[PDB]
Design an enzyme around this catalytic site. Structure first.
Site, PDB file in Angstrom:
ATOM      1  N   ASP C 346       0.869  -1.156   0.000  1.00 57.87           N
ATOM      2  CA  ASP C 346       0.000   0.000   0.000  1.00 57.87           C
ATOM      3  C   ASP C 346       0.935   1.244   0.000  1.00 57.87           C
ATOM      4  O   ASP C 346       2.088   1.161   0.522  1.00 57.87           O
ATOM      5  CB  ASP C 346      -0.970   0.052   1.190  1.00 57.87           C
ATOM      6  N   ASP C 687      -2.132  -0.348   6.014  1.00 54.72           N
ATOM      7  CA  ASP C 687      -2.434   0.374   7.245  1.00 54.72           C
ATOM      8  C   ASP C 687      -3.892   0.760   7.506  1.00 54.72           C
ATOM      9  O   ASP C 687      -4.358   0.657   8.645  1.00 54.72           O
ATOM     10  CB  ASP C 687      -1.602   1.660   7.285  1.00 54.72           C
ATOM     11  N   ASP C 691      -7.392  -1.741   3.277  1.00 51.85           N
ATOM     12  CA  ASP C 691      -6.489  -2.871   3.179  1.00 51.85           C
ATOM     13  C   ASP C 691      -7.015  -4.088   3.923  1.00 51.85           C
ATOM     14  O   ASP C 691      -6.428  -5.168   3.797  1.00 51.85           O
ATOM     15  CB  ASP C 691      -5.105  -2.497   3.720  1.00 51.85           C
TER      16      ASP C 691
HETATM   17 MG   LIG Z   1      -3.029   3.349   3.511  1.00 52.75          MG
END
Ligand SMILES: [Mg+2]
Ligand SMILES: *[C@@H]1O[C@H](CO[C@@H]2O[C@@H](C)[C@@H](O)[C@@H](O)[C@@H]2O)[C@@H](O[C@@H]2O[C@H](CO)[C@@H](O[C@@H]3O[C@H](CO[C@H]4O[C@H](CO)[C@@H](O)[C@H](O)[C@@H]4O)[C@@H](O)[C@H](O[C@H]4O[C@H](CO)[C@@H](O)[C@H](O)[C@@H]4O)[C@@H]3O)[C@H](O)[C@H]2NC(C)=O)[C@H](O)[C@H]1NC(C)=O
Ligand SMILES: CCCCCCCC/C=C\CCCCCCCC(=O)OC[C@H](COP(=O)(O)OCC[N+](C)(C)C)OC(=O)CCCCCCC/C=C\CCCCCCCC
Ligand SMILES: CCCCCCCC/C=C\CCCCCCCC(=O)OC[C@H](COP(=O)(O)OCC[N+](C)(C)C)OC(=O)CCCCCCC/C=C\CCCCCCCC
Ligand SMILES: CCCCCCCC/C=C\CCCCCCCC(=O)OC[C@H](COP(=O)(O)OCC[N+](C)(C)C)OC(=O)CCCCCCC/C=C\CCCCCCCC
Ligand SMILES: CCCCCCCC/C=C\CCCCCCCC(=O)OC[C@H](COP(=O)(O)OCC[N+](C)(C)C)OC(=O)CCCCCCC/C=C\CCCCCCCC
Ligand SMILES: CCCCCCCC/C=C\CCCCCCCC(=O)OC[C@H](COP(=O)(O)OCC[N+](C)(C)C)OC(=O)CCCCCCC/C=C\CCCCCCCC
Ligand SMILES: CCCCCCCC/C=C\CCCCCCCC(=O)OC[C@H](COP(=O)(O)OCC[N+](C)(C)C)OC(=O)CCCCCCC/C=C\CCCCCCCC
Ligand SMILES: CCCCCCCC/C=C\CCCCCCCC(=O)OC[C@H](COP(=O)(O)OCC[N+](C)(C)C)OC(=O)CCCCCCC/C=C\CCCCCCCC
Ligand SMILES: CCCCCCCC/C=C\CCCCCCCC(=O)OC[C@H](COP(=O)(O)OCC[N+](C)(C)C)OC(=O)CCCCCCC/C=C\CCCCCCCC
Ligand SMILES: *[C@@H]1O[C@H](CO)[C@@H](O[C@@H]2O[C@H](CO)[C@@H](O)[C@H](O)[C@H]2NC(C)=O)[C@H](O)[C@H]1NC(C)=O
Ligand SMILES: CC(C)CCC[C@@H](C)[C@H]1CC[C@H]2[C@@H]3CC=C4C[C@@H](O)CC[C@]4(C)[C@H]3CC[C@]12C
Ligand SMILES: CC(C)CCC[C@@H](C)[C@H]1CC[C@H]2[C@@H]3CC=C4C[C@@H](O)CC[C@]4(C)[C@H]3CC[C@]12C
Ligand SMILES: C[C@]12CC/C(=N\OCCN)C[C@@H]1C(=O)C[C@@H]1[C@@H]2CC[C@]2(C)C(=O)CC[C@@H]12
Ligand SMILES: [Mg+2]
Ligand SMILES: [Mg+2]
Lengths: 40, 294, 993
Positions: C346, C687, C691
């Protein structure tokens, strides 16, 4: 020898056990020494 | 998967390899295992070169001799009916197997048998444990010595009318000299009468104090009429140096046995180089559970 | 919980009006709802709070640890042992209790292993509970025309809700009136900069429009009003969380390897049992006995200490990880990192820092770079010219933000600053290399400031000059470089001033495009000394008319800024690529910024090119170039929505540097699945909440600890409590090291199997006295052997592990036939021969020669034959011969230890030699010493021949296994030699594990 050949049927297992234990103990100590040798 | 790993036709493989591979692996394992076998065999031959043929190097696991008997009891119990004959067959068959080795026909000639004192005597040393002199000579032991239990008169040996016999025997040990207790003030009660120094005494009794009364008259038969083993039949020089050797035997008749009740009879030998064990119930003594149920 | 309706991309009613909205949910735009109506709805559908997770009782997971794949094998073993005992009890009198002991021991082994594994997962759960810090929150709702602050759990659909910069958006709102309101859409949508929220509609995609506020978002600056459109679990992040919880778990690679291992162990176990069952039925024995033989052979072939050894093995590598701040919730998730071959990462919050920082600065016709790293470990920018000082005064003065009260303790970059992200970044840079701005600001009093205007496109202000020799007035202004360029005529070069001829004007244009192409935002700063003769110290310049010369100013220099990546991000990405791990970026940010960050962290190696780059370098349309000449590709989310399964497969099959931009969380999940469809292991590092569906379906999820969301933190398998990215590299290294070690320990615990079974086989086929008892096998498997096998984990690398390519999952396994050929075929065979050697020696020294032992078991076992003739003619009672058999068991066990010495040494290294690696492993040395001390203790301590049935040995016997051990050492040494000199030869494809 002859008639009184009684020793031909005796074995000092006591002394053998004593020595085998002394040796086991020593090996155990040495082991510990090697294991902690470095963390001091 | 299932089919391919079994036989594919492009690489011409069976189970995984081609024709030539299974051979490389089989040949390798054959050579490897062959070397392994040859090494193990060599290390076993040096071992055969290390031991002696006339004497066991270690004789400490057999120092205090045992006390076995002729009947083969499954749980050291003798139970049989005086009516049904197919009840004491297992006993007579064994007894017979044991006495069948003391047949006079077997003991004949000068070689390798020798006539010994008809009365208990002392030890006899036929030299050392060597091959210098040929096969040593052993004393003859006659059947008839055992009077009412010999299978020569009453084949059954007693079991036919409520009077069984029990042939006791001392375990054969190489170079073992039996030594009896001396005449000093400390000796069991029993042993005082008939102290033939040359006889190793065997005396049976009852395990519990109660059973005394229910056990009748223990009649022992042996060499010279004594209840023991004559010292002249020792020592034993081993199979290699004394094939055709016979060990003394002692017969015990349990006459006047109470009917329909389990009797615990403990037989015991007495002597210096004889010691018992609380773990091994056959070291020097022996136990029998007789029950003549009729 | 319909998953397909949750897998679909979000839909909405954004494209409407304020009248249509109020007409659909029911609500007064100026008076809101009524309290009675509000409560009627509150009770009608439920509070505005997400549902709690599905609680997991502790007895459930304890029972879970008691089961599995390995523990189940030991369970069936115990069951079989008791079955054979039952048969022996009902069929024969005086049944030995060997089987009942072995069964209770196996059950105890399973229970102990379960207790230890369960305790570890609980430890991690406690340290995990110490992070959920939930402070209640209250929203501002307008009912009956009045403003009231009520708990977040009492907001319903339809009432009016007002927000203010610093508060959190309660539910999903529909903005009706805003006043320069900005929101942080980083966790839900992934937008790094603050997107302004406006009552008007702008994009067909609800996540892109500005008339909708979202759940869990925060209003950075401004105030706004809005009608609650979505409430409770029905919210966007509510559907995302519910989808995350309604996803399966999977099955790690280590579990599959252990499973195939048990498959082989059972194959050879049932094979040896059904075969010796037919052989015994051919040699005379009865059925009742053959059944017991079958069960006994199938149970002896089961490794019991392997379960405990493997558990401790896995447990050791997890502590090393916990020492560097890498916590795993499960226990096997420690190996998945080493087996990974494609890492999907990410950008916002994972690859970057999500914090604006001053990157490049323009002054004295020269680009200067500033340190944009967390711990400030870099290069200064030459703070010796006067130009820089003037720049510091411009930025430090013409800026209204100030650090939040009480930050005197945190560092200069991590403290809280009240204001826009640009003024904050500027304030931090000035406070970083120019000292305290609070004194720099009080040193020059601000007289008049004209706030940023939508028309002026600039921010200016006048302050007094602290020069004690000059009482004039200072004027400073900042703004877009184009607007400010059109307002200057001089340039502060190295301190002095110069005209603005076209030479520097062009140098300024190239500088603008240089900082712009870097994906950064540039600003221009200029100032001017107001003549105190035309504007005395007493004249007041009220902000009404032209009191300051807009033009003729003195431009000092440009100042760019952008969010920089975390410290160990480039190095870690490079390390992963070095190990053959494919790095694929998956983020929902603007592609113009994603491509620049990619060209900055290593995903898109410098030099590679995209199809658009080629079309731009040649000046031809994009439909003409061939897509095979482009190694890296940027796939847009809008385009990803319209792509078939094969197309995605080809995208991953032909492009080595892929970057998925503007992808929704559902699309992230689709990408992870597209990677798995081929056959590679996947690790997703993230995070936020977007996700969560990606970390769950991936083979292994890595969530950030400080900057991560609670949902993604609870749905991940590995947590980075320190937010360090180099840890990924550390993990991939440890994952391999502990793998080669598991192989070595397995071969060790499997080599002793042969010298532990062969005796019974020769017992039934050859009829010799029993060579190896049951309490001895137990003293070898569960005792001595444990410490050495555990020590085999502490082995260092042989060659560079961070250099070889990732292991192939379809071909290179954990337990192959090459291992079985060694443990069961060559080493175990020698150990068995050594044991039989010591055996025959003990029986030959006491009187039983090898020729008379074949054919004696019937009388050697019989309990009523008190006259057993030996090779010399002696008569042995029953207990006397049994004592010797037991002493033979004791020496057999000691022989096992002697051969295990050389086995532990040949197992230490798989290829390299002992004289190369070295005996630097202190644990292995301790294992050998302890292994010997235990055997001596079990034999020489009084009362052992009573309790365990082990008699003392005579000092000459202990030396019967030494030659076999040295031979084992020499054979394996020459083995590990041809492999080195001859790479790819027979010894390698036949004996190389
Ligand atoms: Mg992120
Ligand atoms: C050691 O001595 C054993 C006894 O020796 C006998 O007595 C000594 C003192 C000498 O006089 C010697 O010459 C004697 O033979 C000797 O065992 C004996 O072997 C013979 C030959 O097989 C047996 O004779 C057979 O008897 C059976 C029936 O036996 C019944 O009694 C015995 C107990 O005595 C039971 O065990 C049985 O179950 C029976 O209840 C006859 O049926 C059989 O018939 C055969 O002979 C006749 C002619 O007579 C033929 O018409 C038939 O066709 C048969 O061929 C025999 O008559 C004798 O029973 C047996 N004695 C004992 C006590 O078992 C032993 O072999 C010697 N061992 C060595 C190593 O020297
Ligand atoms: C690098 C790794 C180093 C590892 C070191 C580990 C430390 C080893 C620790 C101790 C070992 C020494 C043991 C000594 C014990 C002697 C005790 C003793 O009194 O024992 C007598 C028995 C004879 O018993 P019996 O049955 O005849 O009488 C029985 C008579 N009753 C029973 C009637 C009494 O004898 C015995 O036990 C014999 C004892 C065994 C003899 C030791 C052989 C050493 C083998 C190889 C080492 C060679 C080193 C070469 C140097 C190279 C330098 C570069
Ligand atoms: C950080 C530093 C750490 C250092 C720690 C050091 C620890 C201390 C080290 C060594 C201590 C040595 C103790 C020696 C004891 C000798 C006991 C002994 O010789 O007893 C022998 C006799 C039994 O002979 P028997 O006639 O029955 O034989 C059988 C004959 N048949 C079968 C033929 C009839 O004893 C008897 O009667 C009476 C026995 C009474 C019970 C004694 C208890 C001994 C048991 C364990 C102690 C040993 C531990 C050593 C450390 C090992 C670590 C792994
Ligand atoms: C009293 C006397 C004492 C007796 C003691 C006996 C102790 C027992 C000792 C060892 C047990 C041996 C049992 C067999 C072990 C075979 C190992 C095995 O099955 O491992 C499994 C492997 C799988 O491996 P992977 O995962 O790497 O495959 C990957 C394939 N991918 C990647 C292409 C998909 O499968 C394979 O190897 C394929 C299967 C090959 C099976 C070969 C069978 C050979 C068995 C006996 C031969 C006897 C002939 C004797 C006559 C010789 C002529 C003179
Ligand atoms: C007839 C009887 C048959 C018995 C068969 C079974 C035998 C199994 C037992 C022992 C086998 C011993 C094999 C000896 C191997 C020695 C290898 C050696 O010496 O290789 C030298 C290494 C290499 O150094 P480098 O160049 O990489 O250093 C670089 C340093 N830089 C980085 C600073 C430059 O140096 C190092 O490993 C560092 C120093 C390590 C010193 C190790 C000494 C301990 C050795 C054995 C322990 C004894 C166990 C006894 C078990 C019995 C218990 C009762
Ligand atoms: C860093 C931390 C270091 C810690 C190291 C710890 C090391 C501990 C070292 C030594 C302690 C061991 C336990 C001591 C046992 C003393 C037993 C004892 O003194 O017995 C004496 C008497 C024997 O008398 P007697 O000769 O008249 O019998 C004649 C019997 N007739 C004639 C009928 C045959 O005993 C009897 O009677 C009954 C015998 C009772 C049997 C007890 C043996 C326990 C069995 C298994 C436990 C061993 C597990 C292994 C643990 C390893 C830990 C490392
Ligand atoms: C970290 C390093 C650890 C090292 C430790 C080594 C691990 C050991 C692993 C497995 C060994 C355990 C196997 C348990 C064996 C129990 C044997 C048993 O129950 O036999 C029953 C015998 C009956 O015999 P009989 O029929 O001939 O009697 C005839 C009596 N007449 C004739 C006079 C009436 O009764 C007797 O011996 C009575 C005396 C009872 C003795 C109980 C001894 C229990 C020993 C160990 C259990 C604790 C171990 C926990 C440590 C785990 C380590 C991970
Ligand atoms: C009854 C007979 C008793 C005989 C006793 C003899 C004792 C001899 C004492 C020491 C041996 C000499 C020291 C060896 C030092 C060699 C140093 C060295 O530079 O080595 C390198 C070579 C490997 O080269 P490479 O090209 O494969 O490397 C390839 C590297 N890449 C893969 C990166 C390309 O290493 C090698 O050849 C290592 C191969 C050596 C194999 C011989 C094993 C000898 C057997 C036992 C030794 C005694 C220890 C146990 C003590 C028991 C006491 C009772
Ligand atoms: C008490 C316990 C005692 C145990 C003692 C055990 C001693 C027995 C040791 C070895 C005997 C086995 C020799 C087998 C020779 C026939 C094997 C054969 O037919 O092989 C053919 C290949 C040549 O085909 P290729 O590779 O060109 O074709 C390429 C084909 N494709 C692609 C499949 C690779 O052969 C090659 O590669 C060459 C490989 C040859 C194998 C070398 C192994 C040496 C291992 C140990 C010797 C050390 C003994 C030390 C003992 C000291 C005692 C004190
Ligand atoms: C054998 O035991 C019997 C008892 O079973 C003894 O005979 C008994 O003697 C008592 C007198 O003490 C009489 O009252 C019984 O009537 C007798 N019973 C029988 C069956 O005779 C007998 O004396 C014992 N004989 C020997 C030699 O011990
Ligand atoms: C690294 C290598 C070469 C070391 C080999 C050490 C061997 C020789 C050592 C390890 C343990 C030792 C045994 C430990 C205990 C006893 C019992 C004692 O009553 C006689 C000696 C005896 C039997 C020792 C003989 C030597 C021995 C077997
Ligand atoms: C290193 C390896 C391959 C060597 C193996 C050598 C083998 C073949 C040698 C070692 C010891 C040898 C044995 C030594 C003693 C005897 C006794 C004799 O009356 C017949 C031959 C016989 C049985 C030999 C046969 C061959 C033998 C087993
Ligand atoms: C087979 C065995 C149990 C299993 C065993 N080892 O189990 C270790 C698991 N890795 C070996 C034991 C033996 O050799 C002796 C076996 C015993 C089962 C019960 C047996 C078969 C008997 O009735 C007499 C011999 C006993
Ligand atoms: Mg997971
Ligand atoms: Mg085992």
């Amino acid at each position: 020898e002859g008639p009184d050949n009684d020793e031909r049927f005796t074995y000092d297992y006591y002394r053998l056990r004593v020595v085998g234990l002394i040796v086991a103990a020593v090996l155990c100590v040495i082991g510990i020494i090697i294991l902690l040798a470095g963390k001091c | 998967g299932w089919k391919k790993f079994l036989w594919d036709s492009e690489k011409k493989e069976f189970l995984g390899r081609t024709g030539s591979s299974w051979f490389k692996i089989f040949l390798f394992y054959l050579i490897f295992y062959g070397c392994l076998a040859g090494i193990f065999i060599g290390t076993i031959q040096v071992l055969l070169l290390t031991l002696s043929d006339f004497e066991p190097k270690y004789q400490d696991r057999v120092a205090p001799p045992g006390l076995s008997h002729a009947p083969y009891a499954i749980k050291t119990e003798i139970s049989f009916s005086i009516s049904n004959p197919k009840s004491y067959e297992s006993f007579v068959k064994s007894m017979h197997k044991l006495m069948d080795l003391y047949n006079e026909s077997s003991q004949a000639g000068n070689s390798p048998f020798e006539d010994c004192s008809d009365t208990p005597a002392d030890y006899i040393k036929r030299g050392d444990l060597d091959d210098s002199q040929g096969q040593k000579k052993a004393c003859r032991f006659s059947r008839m010595w055992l009077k009412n239990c010999s299978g020569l008169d009453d084949t059954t040996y007693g079991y036919a009318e409520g009077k069984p016999c029990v042939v006791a025997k001392l375990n054969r040990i190489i170079g073992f000299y039996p030594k009896p207790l001396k005449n000093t003030t400390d000796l069991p009660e029993e042993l005082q009468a008939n102290y033939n120094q040359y006889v190793l005494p065997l005396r049976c009794a009852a395990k519990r104090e109660e059973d005394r009364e229910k056990i009748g008259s223990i009649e022992y038969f042996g060499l010279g009429g004594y209840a023991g083993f004559p010292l002249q039949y020792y020592p034993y020089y081993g199979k290699r140096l004394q094939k055709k050797y016979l060990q003394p035997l002692l017969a015990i008749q349990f006459t006047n046995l109470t009917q329909n009740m389990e009797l615990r009879i403990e037989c015991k030998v007495y002597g210096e180089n004889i010691d018992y064990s609380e773990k091994d119930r056959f070291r020097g003594r022996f136990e029998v559970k007789i029950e003549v149920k009729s | 919980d319909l998953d397909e309706l949750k897998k679909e991309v979000s839909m909405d009613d954004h494209k409407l009006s304020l009248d249509e909205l109020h007409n659909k949910y029911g609500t007064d735009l100026t008076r809101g709802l009524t309290n009675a109506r509000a409560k009627e709805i509150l009770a009608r559908d439920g509070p505005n709070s997400l549902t709690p997770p599905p609680t997991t009782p502790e007895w459930i997971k304890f029972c879970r640890q008691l089961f599995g794949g390995f523990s189940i094998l030991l369970w069936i073993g115990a069951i079989l042992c008791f079955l054979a005992y039952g048969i022996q009890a009902a069929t024969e009198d005086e049944p030995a209790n060997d089987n009942l002991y072995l069964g209770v021991v196996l059950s105890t082994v399973v229970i102990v292993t379960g207790c230890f594994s369960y305790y570890q997962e609980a430890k991690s759960s406690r340290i995990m509970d110490s992070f959920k810090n939930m402070v209640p929150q209250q929203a501002l709702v307008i009912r009956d025309g009045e403003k009231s602050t009520i708990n977040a759990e009492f907001v319903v659909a339809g009432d009016l809700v007002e927000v203010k910069g610093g508060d959190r958006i309660p539910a999903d709102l529909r903005i009706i009136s805003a006043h320069g309101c900005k929101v942080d859409n980083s966790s839900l949508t992934g937008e790094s900069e603050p997107q302004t929220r406006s009552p008007e509609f702008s994009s067909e995609n609800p996540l892109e429009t500005r008339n909708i506020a979202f759940f869990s978002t925060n209003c950075v600056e401004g105030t706004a009003r809005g009608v609650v459109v979505y409430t409770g679990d029905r919210t966007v992040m509510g559907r995302i969380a519910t989808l995350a919880s309604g996803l399966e778990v999977g099955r790690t690679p280590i579990a599959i390897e252990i499973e195939h291992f048990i498959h082989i162990i059972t194959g050879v176990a049932v094979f040896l049992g059904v075969s010796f069952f037919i052989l015994s039925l051919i040699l005379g024995y009865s059925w009742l006995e053959a059944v017991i033989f079958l069960i006994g052979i199938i149970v002896a072939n089961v490794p019991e200490g392997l379960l405990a050894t493997v558990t401790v093995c896995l447990t050791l590598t997890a502590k090393r990880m916990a020492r560097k701040n890498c916590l795993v919730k499960n226990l096997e998730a420690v190996e998945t990192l080493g087996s990974t071959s494609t890492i999907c990462s990410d950008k916002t919050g994972t690859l970057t820092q999500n914090r604006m920082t001053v990157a490049h600065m323009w002054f004295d016709n020269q680009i200067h770079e500033a340190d944009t790293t967390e711990n400030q470990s870099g290069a200064a920018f030459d703070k010796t010219s006067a130009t820089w000082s003037a720049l510091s005064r411009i930025a430090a003065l013409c800026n209204r933000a100030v650090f939040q009260a009480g930050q005197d303790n945190v560092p200069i970059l991590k403290r809280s600053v009240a204001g826009d992200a640009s003024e904050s970044a500027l304030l931090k840079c000035i406070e970083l290399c120019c000292g305290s701005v609070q004194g720099m600001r009080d040193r020059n009093p601000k007289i008049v400031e004209i706030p940023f205007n939508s028309t002026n496109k600039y921010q200016l202000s006048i302050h007094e000059n602290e020069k004690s020799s000059e009482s004039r007035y200072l004027l400073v202004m900042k703004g877009a470089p184009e607007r400010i360029l059109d307002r200057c005529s001089t340039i502060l070069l190295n301190g002095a001033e110069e005209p603005l001829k076209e030479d520097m004007k062009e140098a300024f244009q190239n500088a603008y495009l240089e900082l712009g192409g870097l994906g950064e935002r540039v600003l221009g700063f200029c100032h001017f000394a107001l003549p105190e003769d035309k504007y005395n110290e007493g004249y007041p310049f009220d902000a009404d008319e032209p009191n300051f010369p807009t033009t003729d100013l003195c431009f000092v220099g440009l100042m760019a800024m952008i969010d920089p990546p975390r410290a160990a991000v480039p190095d870690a990405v490079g390390k992963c690529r070095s190990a053959g791990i494919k790095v694929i970026m998956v983020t929902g940010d603007h592609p113009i910024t994603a491509k620049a960050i990619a060209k900055g962290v290593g995903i898109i190696s410098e030099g590679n090119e995209t199809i658009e780059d080629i079309a731009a370098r040649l000046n031809i349309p994009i439909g003409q170039v061939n897509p095979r000449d482009a190694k890296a590709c940027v796939v847009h989310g809008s385009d990803l929505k319209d792509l078939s399964t094969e197309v995605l497969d080809d995208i991953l099959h032909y492009h080595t540097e892929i970057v998925f931009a503007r992808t929704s969380p559902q699309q992230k999940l689709i990408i992870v699945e597209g990677c798995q469809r081929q056959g590679a292991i996947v690790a997703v590092t993230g995070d936020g909440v977007n996700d969560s569906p990606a970390l769950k379906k991936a083979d292994i999820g890595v969530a950030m600890g400080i900057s991560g969301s609670d949902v993604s933190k609870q749905a991940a398998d590995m947590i980075l409590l320190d937010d360090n990215f180099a840890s990924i590299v550390t993990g991939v290294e440890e994952g391999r090291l502990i793998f080669d070690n598991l192989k070595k320990s397995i071969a060790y615990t499997l080599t002793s199997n042969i010298p532990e079974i062969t005796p019974f086989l020769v017992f039934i086929i050859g009829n010799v006295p029993l060579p190896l008892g049951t309490v001895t096998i137990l003293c070898i498997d569960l005792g001595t052997d444990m410490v050495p096998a555990i020590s085999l984990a502490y082995e260092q690398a042989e060659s560079d592990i961070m250099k070889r390519q990732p292991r192939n999952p379809k071909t290179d396994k954990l337990v192959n036939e090459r291992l079985i050929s060694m443990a069961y075929g060559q080493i175990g065979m020698i150990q068995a021969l050594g044991g039989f050697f010591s055996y025959f020696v003990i029986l030959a020294e006491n009187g039983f020669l090898p020729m008379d032992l074949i054919g004696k078991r019937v009388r050697w076992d019989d309990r009523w034959i008190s006259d057993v003739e030996d090779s010399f003619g002696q008569q042995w009672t029953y207990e006397q011969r049994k004592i010797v058999e037991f002493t033979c068991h004791t020496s057999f066990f000691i022989s096992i230890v002697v051969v295990q010495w050389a086995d532990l040494i040949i197992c230490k290294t798989r290829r390299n030699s002992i004289f190369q690696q070295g005996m630097k492993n202190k644990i292995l040395i301790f294992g050998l010493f302890e292994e010997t001390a235990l055997a001596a203790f079990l034999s020489y301590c009084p009362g052992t021949d009573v309790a365990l049935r082990m008699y003392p040995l005579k000092p000459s016997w202990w030396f019967c296994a030494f030659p076999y051990s040295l031979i084992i050492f020499l054979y394996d040494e020459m083995r590990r030699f041809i492999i080195r000199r001859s790479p790819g030869g027979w010894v390698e494809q036949e004996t190389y594990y």
